[PDB]
Structures are given as C-alpha cells and as structure tokens.
RNA sequence: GGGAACUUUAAGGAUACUGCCAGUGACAAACUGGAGGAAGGCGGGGACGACGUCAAGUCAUCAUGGCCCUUACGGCCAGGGCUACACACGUGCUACAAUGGUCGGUACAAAGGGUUGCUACACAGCGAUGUGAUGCUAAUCUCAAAAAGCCGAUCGUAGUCCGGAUUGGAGUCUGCAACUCGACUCCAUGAAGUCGGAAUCGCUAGUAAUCGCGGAUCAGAAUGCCGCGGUGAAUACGUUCCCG
C-alpha cells in the first residue's frame, strides 16, 4: 500500500512494514500505530481504506523522504561552505568525529587505493 | 546491662590470636563471661609489579597483604575487669578497639 | 557538549576586549589565544586573529558562525597529500 | 603421548534412556557447552520418530546407526570399531542441519527416518565412500 | 624525575592548599538553589577566575623517592621499582609473595 | 530424622530424610518449580529410584551456591549420605552406582601471561 | 523470644603410606587386575629456575667512571603536537544468523570495591541523569540487575525483524576548560559482511569452547592487563616425515 509515495510491504506486520519508508523507525511506527489505534502485528493487507488513510495522515506530520533528504543535504553543504573543521573533513571525505585515520577509516575512504 | 565489645585488627594472625588469648585469659582471671573470640572473614589485597626496569610485560611479581579481624565480647563484667583491660600492655602490630 | 544549566563559556579577558570594541567603533582586530571561547552574537562583524600554534589567522565573524568555538576556524595541522 | 597410553574418556549414560550411544550423540550435537539445547533437540527428535511409528527409540537408533556405519574411509584405512559410529553420528548431524524442516529436532528426526528407510543424504554418502573405497 | 618537575609538583600542591577553602565556598554557592541567579553567576565567574594551579585536576602522583609519574600504587605511595626493592628486603609490613 | 550434607562446585545442600509418602521440598518450592530443566530433575531422583523407595520417604532440602548442575549434584550427594546414615546396609549399592564419591573438580585459576588457565595468545615467528 | 543443631566463617590437628588380596618379573627394578576409603599409585594448581650462553635489554626509575652545555643542551609561561594518512604488518573486539533475533514472564554464583566515598526509598525525565532523604568506617548499609538458562508469542531463509559501521539532529556528566581531542543517552540513517587463497596459531578435562561479574591505574576516559564464578565437549592408532 502506497504510503509517503513508497510501496511498503504488504505481507508483513504494520510495525515492520512502516520502516521501509525513509525516516521512520521502530519507535516512530509504534507511535503512529498507537495514535491511529491499530495493533502492531496487524498485517498491511488487512487494513481498510480509512485505516490506511489515517496512517497516511499521521505519517504526513513526520518528515519522511524528500524533505528529509533535502534537509540533510542542505545541512552538509552549509558546513562545507562555512569553512569549519567539520566542513573541511566533509570535503576530503574523512572521519568527522575524531576517529583515527592511520588505520581503519574504510567506511569513509572507500576500498584501499594502491600507491 | 553493659557488654564490652573488643575488636582486634592485624596483618599477622599468630600475633592477633596471641593478643586475643591474652585478653580472654585476663577476663577469665578477674572473673567474667566472654563470647568468642569470633573470627571474621579476612581481607586480601593483591598487587602486580613489573620486575624488569624497561620492557617485559610477562616478567612480573605478585604480592598480597591480608587483614585479619577478631571480635570478643565480655558479658556481665566486674568493676575490676574494666581497669584490667586498660592495665593490659600494648602489642605492636595489633590494633584494639573497645566499645562500651 | 557543555551542559545548558551552566551556560556558554567565554574567557573574561576576551569578553572585556569585545565589550570595548563593540562599545567604541574600533576597527583594529582582536588578537587572541583563547580558542575555547564560544562565539556570541555580539561577536558578529568583528575580526579576531586566533592563534593556531605558530601563527594568528584572521577570522571575520558572521551570523552563521555563532555557537561554534573560535578554534573551529583555525586548523592546526598542514596536509597536502602523500 | 610417546610414553604412555591414554584411557578413553568415559561418559555416563543418558538420564532418560540410560544409553551411552545416546549420550555420545548428544555430545556430538552440542555446541559451545550448551547441553540443554542439545537435549531438547535429541529427545524431541526421538519423540517425533516414536509418534510417527511405535518402536523403541533406543533400538531404532541402534539400527539406523548400524545402517549408517561406514566400513572404511578413503587410500582406504582400516579403522577401529569406535570410529565408525562417530563418523555415522557426524554424517547424521550434518544431513539434518542441511535439511529444511522448521526446527532442528524435526529435521533430525526426518534424517533418521530417511536413513532407516534407506534413501537419504547420509546413506548416499556412505555408499559413495564404499564406491571410492572398494576400488583400491 | 627532574628536580624541576618535583619543584613544579610542590608549588602546585601549595597553591591547591592556599585556595582550597574559597573553592569550596564558591562551589557550594553555585550549588545553592535559594541563592539568586546573579549571585550564582558571580560565583561561577569567581570560580573561573582563580589561578589554574588551584584546580586539583592538575596534580599528578609521583613516586616519592624518585618522582616517577608512572606505576604509582596509591596504597604505598611508591612506584614499582622502589616498591619491588623495598618489599623484597622486609621493610614493608605484612607484604609477602602471593600464591594460590 | 536423618541428615546429610552434599557438595559440588561451590554448591552445598542440606538434606533431611524421614519416613513418609514421597513428599519433596527444595527451598519451599517443588521440584518442578525449582528446576525448569528436566535432566536436573532426573539427577535429583536417581537415588530413590535406584533404591525403589521413591514413595517410602520424605525429603526437606535447602541449597546454596553454585548453578543448576552443581546444585543438583550436591542434592544427590546429600540424599545418598542421608540414606547411608539411615541404613548402613545400603552403602554398597550406592558406592557401586557412584553416588558415594565426592566430585573434586573445580575451576582452575587464570595465570599470568595467559588468556585463561591454559589458553595462550597467538604466536607468530615474525 | 529463642536455640548452638546444620550451613558458613578461621586457627589448630588427623588422614594415603603400595596401606591389604591375586598373577608375574633374575628370587633386581617393577608391572598388571581387585576390596575398604572422599580420594590408589607424582591427588590438582601456584611460588621456587644449578654451572653457563647471547660484550642480549635498560645511563629515560635509580646509582655511577669519563666526555660535553652552563645568557644555555639550565629554569618559567600561553597555544599547538604526541590523535596527522596515497599505504604495509602484528595483537584483539563485533558479525555474517533459526543450536538465532525480538518481545512478555520467571530461576541459580563466586571474588572484589566503598567516607575529597557507596547509596535504600520518594519524586521528575523516554533516557544518560537531577532533586530530597536514609544506612554504613561494613559478615550489620551499599555497588547489585548476574548472563547464558526454563515457559509462551512472533519472525520463515530474506542482505531479512541478521549485522551495527558511517552520518544529520537533540542532550547529560566530569572538569577553570571537551574545537583540534572525552565518555555516555535519545530520534533518524542502516555501510562492508553469505564462514574467508597460499599459509599459519592455541588447546589433552572442570581443559577447549561459550556466558556474565570485579579491580589497579584513575576528576573524567578499556574491546588491554590482573582476577572471579556459571554451562561444559571431542580425539589420540603411532614416531617414519616437520620443529627444538
Ligand atoms: Mg649491545
């Protein structure tokens, strides 16, 4: 069932299925379903039109996919523009939170590039 | 209804047991009931010390120090008993704490 | 970060210098070694030369710099590639 | 050793059927010292086979192990009587794990039933060992 | 250790003692809830205005015979070299080699 | 009427054995409530099953220290000693069954320079 | 209220010595199989390291011959660095899932630490934690929830309800001060990874494996080091080849 523009899985429980939308975790799904009054284990292929619409309305109040990506990109570019140390690390693609780089920085650096 | 409670601490169990024996013998001599001496569980602290000056992590010495304790109660004491305890000598290496 | 109940941290000797500079119309930079002081809204528009270990680097404070420490704008190491 | 002969580690019989072979199969199943889970697997599988067919679990397991006992292992090497039962136990454990029944106890009982019937992965492996063995 | 570093340590120990009382007073005022906001803020500034050496965080434990800043062992107040030497001659009471 | 002490791996069980009808209490719980593991229950009943006196006695037990297996072993040892105390003629069969001997295995200490009692850190020639 | 029985606490002592039975070995040395006993052939573990070797390690713990500096190679201070990063190697931790993950309920330890300390209980917060207050100088009060385990529900082999790296927001505490460069909490994000080439390491029983707990250093800052207990295996025919 399309929610927030996404085809969330239809054979899984609601609490799991809602997590396929960007920006919605276990906590957020449990709160959305608690608000609209649906059991977490209810399967998505068992929800009527009104039930789906209520979840859509609640999920609207939380920033999910495009707004969230836009906000993240803007925050990163603002740091890369101000000229702070964090922006300088973002520019060179290096750890931002004080981790060592003599070894073990592969998530940020990529596969090891030969000399 | 006053029961005297003496607590003995030391690093040496032979010395502590000698002092406890002296105390109980004096109490019985002047005439009084005594409970104990009652042994208390010992404290053990352990230390690891590098033996080489510069570098050998496995070359080490392991030391320990133990504190032993004893509890003695003098029940229904006589007037002379209290003065006898004060008259008793002081032994190096044994701490005595008497509560009335 | 620093707890909110304590508030922000600013060195007294730098705070007095900024007080004087803002109260008057001085254009001369403010020369400082205090890289741990926070940038307050009163800093905006001023110029502070911040120590980096060997040199004082000019910094022109904009609104977007408020809430950062002075030293976040003076890198202390030199790297150019292997 | 090079100077002595070590006595075989003697294990007690199991507490529910009193069988040394059952105890040894349980120890072969157990991982990381978790005996309780191994017991729940082995006893559960024996109960499953008993429910499917009314025979004594101990003698049924004896017969299945006799069927899955390899004669030799490839060059072929003559082996002492103790090793063939161990090899049968290991093959039985592996085949059940590779099968696909929901719980390990059930897929173990399934392996045992197939081995008894004479068509299964473990018995096929035994035949393969025999075929690469008797040639040399 | 160098005699200069030892003297540094002594000077810091003197400064901490000299400013110990006012530090406690200031921190108690900062902790007070009945005291008003401007009083608490003045306390915070007066705390931040004391000389750095008054802060006990800038003390470092040293051997006491040599001044070594590594391997301190609070209970004895000595570093490992001198502790080994002094323990193995019988001048540390109640300490023996440990086995179990 | 008869008392026994059993010990196994830091576990110590006090057993009081009397004539009765098969009642059995451990720390004010029944066997099922005390032990959720079935073989732990089997171990505790081995002696009276070997003796066939399962309903010919009553058992009041307390246990301290150790874990499930050690406590079950200590309780079995205590029951065996209680039976021996009650009827000395029964000690031979209990010795044959192996319930008379005390297991003396205990955790071996960690040693300086090693990861554990025996395990050694990885060696490399270079 | 009582009791001194049992558990434990901790000083002293007894006990195992081929002690007895059978076969056999030069009638040497001994070696096999049994009964009593908690334990039967060094009971397990720890400390203890002959004579010597490598002109092996340490002048940066310290002492010390000789040589050098002594307006500086001596002393004081503030900021920075020792944490850098095209790469290569050693030692470890966490996973790659169903003998598992999550959720609800409910059991069983030992050894250590505690007054510039550890904190019952109450309130506030989702939480790190904050405020009030109580006992304890500890076999008395406290850190303290053991975890794996047992019972039930769900997940159905999926890069997933596996994995938790990286990154954006918002906070707490220690501290004069967490930018370079602390730990921890919540919301969001959800990378490699499907059991690992040549080759190579540990371990012979309460061991390996696996599960949690404590301490020294120390304002704060352990996946290391030194300890503690819970659950608890497999295999050894043999010295030809590899190493000392
Ligand atoms: Mg040399």
mmCIF file of N, CA and C (backbone and C1' of nucleotides) in Angstrom, chain G residues 202-224:
data_model
loop_
_atom_site.group_PDB
_atom_site.id
_atom_site.type_symbol
_atom_site.label_atom_id
_atom_site.label_comp_id
_atom_site.label_asym_id
_atom_site.label_seq_id
_atom_site.Cartn_x
_atom_site.Cartn_y
_atom_site.Cartn_z
ATOM 1 P P G G 202 51.146 -22.269 19.024
ATOM 2 O "O5'" G G 202 49.829 -22.352 19.920
ATOM 3 C "C5'" G G 202 49.486 -21.316 20.829
ATOM 4 C "C4'" G G 202 48.118 -21.528 21.431
ATOM 5 C "C3'" G G 202 47.896 -22.859 22.132
ATOM 6 O "O3'" G G 202 48.418 -22.883 23.449
ATOM 7 C "C1'" G G 202 46.061 -22.403 20.714
ATOM 8 P P C G 203 49.119 -24.210 24.019
ATOM 9 O "O5'" C G 203 47.907 -25.125 24.498
ATOM 10 C "C5'" C G 203 46.919 -24.634 25.395
ATOM 11 C "C4'" C G 203 45.620 -25.386 25.248
ATOM 12 C "C3'" C G 203 45.704 -26.892 25.436
ATOM 13 O "O3'" C G 203 45.674 -27.267 26.801
ATOM 14 C "C1'" C G 203 44.451 -26.401 23.486
ATOM 15 P P U G 204 46.597 -28.465 27.348
ATOM 16 O "O5'" U G 204 45.552 -29.549 27.862
ATOM 17 C "C5'" U G 204 44.630 -30.146 26.960
ATOM 18 C "C4'" U G 204 44.244 -31.543 27.378
ATOM 19 C "C3'" U G 204 45.228 -32.257 28.304
ATOM 20 O "O3'" U G 204 44.511 -33.137 29.170
ATOM 21 C "C1'" U G 204 44.990 -33.497 26.325
ATOM 22 P P A G 205 44.408 -32.843 30.747
ATOM 23 O "O5'" A G 205 42.925 -32.297 30.932
ATOM 24 C "C5'" A G 205 42.673 -31.068 31.607
ATOM 25 C "C4'" A G 205 41.309 -31.059 32.252
ATOM 26 C "C3'" A G 205 40.987 -32.274 33.120
ATOM 27 O "O3'" A G 205 40.136 -31.875 34.194
ATOM 28 C "C1'" A G 205 39.400 -32.111 31.403
ATOM 29 P P G G 206 40.593 -32.030 35.724
ATOM 30 O "O5'" G G 206 39.409 -31.343 36.537
ATOM 31 C "C5'" G G 206 39.287 -29.924 36.615
ATOM 32 C "C4'" G G 206 38.647 -29.344 35.377
ATOM 33 C "C3'" G G 206 38.365 -27.839 35.422
ATOM 34 O "O3'" G G 206 38.538 -27.291 34.113
ATOM 35 C "C1'" G G 206 36.369 -28.984 35.011
ATOM 36 P P U G 207 38.675 -25.706 33.889
ATOM 37 O "O5'" U G 207 39.483 -25.576 32.521
ATOM 38 C "C5'" U G 207 40.892 -25.744 32.483
ATOM 39 C "C4'" U G 207 41.346 -26.451 31.228
ATOM 40 C "C3'" U G 207 40.857 -25.870 29.910
ATOM 41 O "O3'" U G 207 41.621 -24.754 29.483
ATOM 42 C "C1'" U G 207 40.618 -28.232 29.893
ATOM 43 P P A G 208 40.906 -23.412 28.967
ATOM 44 O "O5'" A G 208 40.395 -23.763 27.500
ATOM 45 C "C5'" A G 208 41.299 -23.888 26.409
ATOM 46 C "C4'" A G 208 40.661 -24.599 25.240
ATOM 47 C "C3'" A G 208 39.470 -23.908 24.594
ATOM 48 O "O3'" A G 208 39.845 -22.897 23.674
ATOM 49 C "C1'" A G 208 38.968 -26.191 24.944
ATOM 50 P P A G 209 39.227 -21.421 23.783
ATOM 51 O "O5'" A G 209 37.697 -21.599 23.380
ATOM 52 C "C5'" A G 209 37.313 -22.077 22.100
ATOM 53 C "C4'" A G 209 35.874 -22.529 22.101
ATOM 54 C "C3'" A G 209 34.854 -21.501 22.582
ATOM 55 O "O3'" A G 209 34.418 -20.640 21.541
ATOM 56 C "C1'" A G 209 34.510 -23.556 23.713
ATOM 57 P P U G 210 34.392 -19.045 21.729
ATOM 58 O "O5'" U G 210 33.078 -18.768 22.586
ATOM 59 C "C5'" U G 210 31.786 -19.034 22.060
ATOM 60 C "C4'" U G 210 30.783 -19.295 23.154
ATOM 61 C "C3'" U G 210 30.548 -18.159 24.141
ATOM 62 O "O3'" U G 210 29.648 -17.179 23.650
ATOM 63 C "C1'" U G 210 30.827 -20.193 25.319
ATOM 64 P P C G 211 29.669 -15.679 24.223
ATOM 65 O "O5'" C G 211 29.066 -15.798 25.695
ATOM 66 C "C5'" C G 211 27.664 -15.817 25.913
ATOM 67 C "C4'" C G 211 27.322 -15.851 27.382
ATOM 68 C "C3'" C G 211 27.781 -14.665 28.214
ATOM 69 O "O3'" C G 211 26.944 -13.531 28.079
ATOM 70 C "C1'" C G 211 28.264 -16.673 29.360
ATOM 71 P P G G 212 27.563 -12.105 27.678
ATOM 72 O "O5'" G G 212 28.033 -11.472 29.064
ATOM 73 C "C5'" G G 212 27.138 -10.733 29.888
ATOM 74 C "C4'" G G 212 27.122 -11.249 31.307
ATOM 75 C "C3'" G G 212 27.930 -10.460 32.330
ATOM 76 O "O3'" G G 212 27.241 -9.325 32.830
ATOM 77 C "C1'" G G 212 28.386 -12.774 32.563
ATOM 78 P P C G 213 28.037 -8.000 33.274
ATOM 79 O "O5'" C G 213 28.764 -8.403 34.631
ATOM 80 C "C5'" C G 213 28.052 -8.424 35.861
ATOM 81 C "C4'" C G 213 28.930 -8.832 37.014
ATOM 82 C "C3'" C G 213 30.112 -7.925 37.310
ATOM 83 O "O3'" C G 213 29.754 -6.777 38.054
ATOM 84 C "C1'" C G 213 30.837 -10.169 37.295
ATOM 85 P P G G 214 30.520 -5.390 37.810
ATOM 86 O "O5'" G G 214 31.868 -5.544 38.640
ATOM 87 C "C5'" G G 214 31.830 -5.739 40.044
ATOM 88 C "C4'" G G 214 33.171 -6.146 40.596
ATOM 89 C "C3'" G G 214 34.295 -5.136 40.453
ATOM 90 O "O3'" G G 214 34.235 -4.113 41.436
ATOM 91 C "C1'" G G 214 35.079 -7.306 39.894
ATOM 92 P P G G 215 34.805 -2.645 41.131
ATOM 93 O "O5'" G G 215 36.383 -2.799 41.250
ATOM 94 C "C5'" G G 215 36.987 -3.250 42.452
ATOM 95 C "C4'" G G 215 38.428 -3.635 42.234
ATOM 96 C "C3'" G G 215 39.347 -2.510 41.786
ATOM 97 O "O3'" G G 215 39.830 -1.772 42.898
ATOM 98 C "C1'" G G 215 39.723 -4.472 40.471
ATOM 99 P P A G 216 40.675 -0.421 42.718
ATOM 100 O "O5'" A G 216 42.069 -0.910 42.120
ATOM 101 C "C5'" A G 216 43.222 -1.094 42.933
ATOM 102 C "C4'" A G 216 44.478 -0.990 42.104
ATOM 103 C "C3'" A G 216 44.726 0.380 41.488
ATOM 104 O "O3'" A G 216 45.522 1.183 42.342
ATOM 105 C "C1'" A G 216 44.871 -1.309 39.811
ATOM 106 P P U G 217 45.262 2.752 42.468
ATOM 107 O "O5'" U G 217 45.606 3.323 41.022
ATOM 108 C "C5'" U G 217 46.936 3.286 40.528
ATOM 109 C "C4'" U G 217 46.993 3.560 39.048
ATOM 110 C "C3'" U G 217 46.297 4.817 38.561
ATOM 111 O "O3'" U G 217 47.080 5.984 38.767
ATOM 112 C "C1'" U G 217 45.878 2.988 37.080
ATOM 113 P P C G 218 46.803 6.942 40.028
ATOM 114 O "O5'" C G 218 45.488 7.743 39.626
ATOM 115 C "C5'" C G 218 45.441 8.557 38.464
ATOM 116 C "C4'" C G 218 44.077 8.519 37.826
ATOM 117 C "C3'" C G 218 42.931 9.071 38.657
ATOM 118 O "O3'" C G 218 42.831 10.483 38.597
ATOM 119 C "C1'" C G 218 42.311 6.978 37.756
ATOM 120 P P A G 219 42.191 11.302 39.817
ATOM 121 O "O5'" A G 219 40.641 11.377 39.470
ATOM 122 C "C5'" A G 219 39.691 11.778 40.445
ATOM 123 C "C4'" A G 219 38.574 12.586 39.831
ATOM 124 C "C3'" A G 219 37.862 11.949 38.649
ATOM 125 O "O3'" A G 219 36.852 11.036 39.053
ATOM 126 C "C1'" A G 219 38.369 14.219 38.164
ATOM 127 P P G G 220 36.729 9.583 38.379
ATOM 128 O "O5'" G G 220 36.330 9.882 36.867
ATOM 129 C "C5'" G G 220 35.083 10.476 36.542
ATOM 130 C "C4'" G G 220 35.066 10.993 35.127
ATOM 131 C "C3'" G G 220 35.503 10.007 34.059
ATOM 132 O "O3'" G G 220 34.458 9.132 33.672
ATOM 133 C "C1'" G G 220 36.587 12.086 33.715
ATOM 134 P P A G 221 34.701 7.545 33.642
ATOM 135 O "O5'" A G 221 35.565 7.322 32.325
ATOM 136 C "C5'" A G 221 35.067 7.706 31.052
ATOM 137 C "C4'" A G 221 36.166 7.790 30.025
ATOM 138 C "C3'" A G 221 37.036 6.552 29.870
ATOM 139 O "O3'" A G 221 36.430 5.537 29.084
ATOM 140 C "C1'" A G 221 38.409 8.467 29.983
ATOM 141 P P A G 222 35.942 4.167 29.768
ATOM 142 O "O5'" A G 222 36.859 3.049 29.113
ATOM 143 C "C5'" A G 222 36.721 1.684 29.487
ATOM 144 C "C4'" A G 222 37.218 0.766 28.403
ATOM 145 C "C3'" A G 222 37.016 -0.722 28.668
ATOM 146 O "O3'" A G 222 36.807 -1.397 27.429
ATOM 147 C "C1'" A G 222 39.319 -0.274 28.450
ATOM 148 P P U G 223 35.614 -2.460 27.260
ATOM 149 O "O5'" U G 223 36.120 -3.401 26.081
ATOM 150 C "C5'" U G 223 36.216 -4.810 26.253
ATOM 151 C "C4'" U G 223 36.920 -5.465 25.090
ATOM 152 C "C3'" U G 223 38.433 -5.241 25.023
ATOM 153 O "O3'" U G 223 39.067 -6.381 24.442
ATOM 154 C "C1'" U G 223 37.435 -4.392 23.072
ATOM 155 P P G G 224 40.068 -7.308 25.292
ATOM 156 O "O5'" G G 224 41.321 -6.370 25.603
ATOM 157 C "C5'" G G 224 42.398 -6.239 24.680
ATOM 158 C "C4'" G G 224 43.623 -5.647 25.333
ATOM 159 C "C3'" G G 224 44.166 -6.384 26.550
ATOM 160 O "O3'" G G 224 45.006 -7.473 26.200
ATOM 161 C "C1'" G G 224 44.024 -4.059 27.015
#
